[model samples]
Target: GRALAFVWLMVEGAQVAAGGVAGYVRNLLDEQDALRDHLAERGWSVEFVLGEPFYDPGAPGYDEERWRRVREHLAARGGRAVRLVSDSDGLDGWGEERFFHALSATGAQLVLDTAERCDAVVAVSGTSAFARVPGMVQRQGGELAAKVLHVHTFGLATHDTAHVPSPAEIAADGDVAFWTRQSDRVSVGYISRYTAELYARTYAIPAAALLPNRSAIPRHAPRFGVLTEERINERIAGLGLPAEGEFVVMWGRNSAPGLDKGYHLLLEAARDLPGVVPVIATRRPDPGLRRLADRYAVPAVLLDDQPFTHLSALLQSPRTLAAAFLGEAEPGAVSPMEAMWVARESGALVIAADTGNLPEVVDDGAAGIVTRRTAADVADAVRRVRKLTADERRRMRAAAAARVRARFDFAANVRELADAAVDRLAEVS
Candidate 1:
């Protein structure tokens, strides 16, 4: 375990061009820099096996397709063919696999003139591995000798990992392992770390200050006031939610099983309380999420992959009287951070669920409230949250926001991640 951890970052790198409307791809790509730094801090050697372009020329980021095209062009001139075998990201059997091979065949045509003759593999389907020229030469042909390290992203982890990559599943991939058992959270951290870093650099504040509505919660944006306010007004006009009464916003998405648990708890609470509405936002809508909406009637909002600016958008769906995040009391999930951000924004009495990472977020009632996921416990917390006056709720929100902003600044967190990666890589490699 002390040996420098070796990481090979495998990505369907081209997705950055066709990412969700909220510019998720751009944000995700920036994570590479931050992730590299984090792995280094943990004494790990990091190498990226990024996929080349596989976007429709019609996509918004057409210019970004140049890298993949160039890589494919090199392979056509007898540079080397990338064998498609090492699909560890579980998106292995997608139809795009055929297209991946096709793209590899055509890549060399784009890059015969320059040193572009070198083949570059583009993981277009999802951030997983495909046997690249180097991998083919090493694992199959026994010609190349290089330690393989790949980094994988999980922006879609909520949707993708459900069936195949349960924690039990993650432990099985021979070529794959995890730095943290909660790779989903790690991936979230990786993505958020980079975002926070750039935000901090520009704003000249802690990365946590970039937390959504951070400075403007319970109010409008102070600096970029007009634009944010107007944008928010337009968006709110679209999503119809309860303007008054209790609103419990569950943070996890429908695609996540743990979220399934939280959704149930909210349903229970809503049933018990006549005025409460449990609104769920899955970031984007898929078939799985549509099913959720049909069943719950809880007003599922599709986020189109909004960045961390959740507070501003969620302002329209205020859960004023009380709020609680009783995440799945199941073993792995206790995302105190989500509750920290949400309750911070709404000024709802925050209740860090008693399972998962709640212990870390709730400092013995100082932040807000804490409760178990049981019907009795949730009901009681709802009562406690209702007891808080408007000012008291506002105070709780402010405190939660301050705690996350001051303590969990993304810049500092990403720096720590970078430092860990560098240190880890140096130790073993």
Candidate 2:
């Protein structure tokens, strides 16, 4: 009769732990097993693959390590039943050719190539993460190619203000079907001071007070304040800055050397041009860089906080700050817009890279300077911001506020996003 004859591989994933990936792996396996049984009852005998992992050092978007685990597990299972998932490991910065090396070894694509031999393989988790496998399938023609499916478990980033590849665009090219859980809650990281606060406000806290219109949905999603943006910021005037030291904000997530977004490059540029001691925050620096930062006089705070500090101190600070570059991911990085808001809120001139959403953020050379991503460029941008006349800075600052208030506003996009993920999942399911 109908074509509902194949298995739907179900995967399970969560933020993995650093403790040698054992306990975390176990928990992930348990969840996957539960998912397998649940799907089995529905007339599908799905396979659970655990322990394969793919590492994307830079833009390690989702936990594709789980699929890496899936690859190995399915192999161990003798290809009993499973789904192949993942996007190209990632390209934020990792050398393109390097991705092929791992792909060669995984044999994951080869597994997917035999899609006609079995049923469809549904990636076990969220959007950004499960994309890697579909990437592999598209890259390597496989018989079961049409059998791959992607399922996204996480919630949409509320203020996903980063104007990068639109989600629709990403989904269109991903080469597999997508399933966003629309659960509205995720257990994201909280490694940095910024992410900790961001997590509380975005995922943990309730939106009743934050979002004026529809706070009911997050309240009702599969997770509780546990997953929703509940009441994490008990007192929301904002991250009450401690009266300790100057809070100079920095974004150090990227670790490349010499480039503007490179933490080392930006810090070195502003080494001499500062009013307050700089507070460098980043997603862990390369070990060698960490040692280098340790040797430097200015204090550098490494961060990996999830959800991140709501607006990040870079946005909230009263001091003029420097993040003289935009990441390839643009707004998703939060550095550019947060800097723009800082310029608007504190009379500080925000200087950023001319790429990504930064150019879109600052109104040309009116409010901020968008320069090439280089040390000298960053130095010049910093100087340019510092040189802005009070009125000039104010004008640019006002522009920053208006731009973010209008373009980056969460409500402007979250509903459509929620509707798309949920509606699509509903349609396909």
Candidate 3:
């Protein structure tokens, strides 16, 4: 018997968030390769429903090359590409433009239309997609006979999906406020156990619906992972920094919100830590960051103008002993965990905030230091890393590498994700 079934991967803004969530998309793209081979042996086909905003040259957020790779990888795997209508921000005309990229305006209809034909509809809700689509899937599934799954990757509430909440809405109660207003028809899945428990308790997400938060790990940058200390220093020298001695790496947009990356705190503290050049990596400069730069007279090297591959080198370099992540949110974000993972692999230590999913990985006094989101706390953590005895540093580095590799290994985790989706479809059958 010859039959064909289809899986429509509902991907929107998940491709280009410049944070840890984006890493999920990146990891999934690679997994699509393995999934293709995995499914093909059993006679299934892979197709992707990508958002229209990605192809728009005028869209002003996200990385072009990374997403292009996403497009190519899906297509290369013999996955069909279906385009969807991107939602407009409702603001009229020229100067009124606020939210630049468009969201999936027709996700509900897209699923309903595709449901009749596809074997399963798999959507990862970390990046884009309105929350209403989940309710549609839950209600229509018995009739349409198509299994639909919307994985909630981030802790942000559904209403706040397309818009950034104001400062007053940045409290712990605030996140619960938004998701609670929804009908709770959709069964949401989280990426980590910590996130699942938090959302289930605070947001009233279905406990039975929570899938195993089998954390996906990033592929080891095999070439860069094994670079010699001397070679890493050569790249550091190219960046016009000293080729020898110690430096700390900090990255991210460092956006300003009531609860945001503690970049300002870190900058103030770095002013007093001499000989420790701060390698600041960001996409662009912001006014608040500009203010911080003016306020602090720390010796720093700005890597915003440099290529990311070079930044990757520094992240994994021996010269860069510790990475700092002071960003925090109630639902919590994973950029800190991502930086810690990279720092771990690159043979550096992590200095992270004791916020969501962070302590899950950092485990105070184990792989790295977990501290309160304060300048003194983070600065003291940095001092602790520097003061580590050589034996202690070696142990920390070894443990850091082992911890992420053991827990996150994305290939294994993503395979688990695919299995969960396919298994759910089977149960429905």
Candidate 4:
């Protein structure tokens, strides 16, 4: 059987990073048994190979406990975890050449063996694309490289202007483009149409060169069924939030800074809306953002590191009027999908920005309100949502759930992606 390998080089594993590519990868792993069966019918076998880079003790965001848990999860799936020798000790000072070299070394040392055995390697992130496994395979007499399909999946940082990669990083990206143009076996995939277009334009690559590899939202539809008022109130009170007043819930990872997550926009929008409370949730509290909310005199409820269950409960609360996801640089965020799924039972609205994949995911005004990326726009959206009649809100909630079922059918999309990967091998052959 033809062997396929999926690679993720990010610091956080699927267990820790519950969103973005990591989340997608986790969903894939969860469906591995079914995926394996599907591929077996086509005479193929799949394996997941995760990258583990060494980090210094003092390195920022380095969590030993987190990695340990990730390793355990990987072990439970019978997946291989490859360790990269490159540590983060001098990562800040490294130039593009050095950065590329380190990843190339990882490719040479760790990934080369897998590429030699596997018929195809699905690199799971834009950063993982820099590993340059095909280049390493080519160096070892070129025969295997010619036969193997190298798939690179592009994500938000590949195109989001808010995340400015260093000059060295830019140079490394240029190298990947040059190499990709030269290889018949090298294929690029994108999570959304918006991201695919942005990446093509940014790299001067043709649209035809990229392939669709939309991610599946983790299956939580069954878990988002309607909760009783008592259950909702209990969840709300657990967060120490008032249970009597209407609120708008907005959440983003602490990794985002400035206008990227639209913290300022939400706070400013909440400034004049005294009737509705702004519930700002993050993995960690940002003191600077809290100060800004204070400066604006917006009585915002700042939450830290709440579980997904708690968030779903909050969104389902009767007092929760809407969920706001107004990030400026979101490229197919999982939050809106999660929010909309939860809203299906709550009749709550979702206010999304007219930015990357937001309007597309929300189906513009069908499922939720699409707002411009500004405080005035967000404030206006809040008022509009508040004014929505009960019937209108019910229709929107139904639309939200319907859209998810129609657009993000996890099993079908994952099967399509696997088929695409297999088809690419035959196309180049």
Q: What is the TM-score of each candidate against the true structure?
A: 0.52, 0.43, 0.78, 0.86
Q: Candidate 3 local accuracy as lDDT?
A: 0.57
lDDT of 4: 0.68
Residue-by-residue lDDT tens digits, candidate 1, 1-429: 322322222223343333221122233334545655665575443333333434444444455444455345434432321222322232322234443343332222222211122222211122222212222222332211122112222222222112443432232221122212212111112233332343234323332212221111112123212224455556555657556656665554444633434655655555456666655554455465446545755444334454445433453234444445665432223234444554454434566666544544555576778787676677677777777777766776777667666654444443444454343323334
lDDT, candidates in the order shown: 0.40, 0.41, 0.57, 0.68
Across residues 200-278, which tens digit of lDDT does each residue of candidate 4 receive? 7776656545666765475454566667878776777878776456788988786354337876788888877768888
In model 1, where is the ten-residue run with the lowest total lDDT?
Answer: 209-218
Best of the two (1, 4) by lDDT: 4
lDDT of 3 by residue, 152-268 (tens): 444443331334653322432232234334423234557666677776775666664665535655646453255566766666667877655577777776455444666666777
- Candidate 3 clash pair list: 217-408, 217-410
lDDT tens readout by residue for model 2, 74-148 = 556344333222235432312223332343224344335444544544332222333334345444544444454
Q: Which parts of model 1 have CA positions greater than 4 angstroms off?
A: 1-8, 11-13, 16-28, 31-234, 255-261, 283-311, 316-326, 329-339, 342-350, 362-365, 389-395
TM-score of 3: 0.78
Clashes of each: 52, 43, 2, 0
Q: Candidate 2: TM-score?
A: 0.43
lDDT of 4 at 151: 55
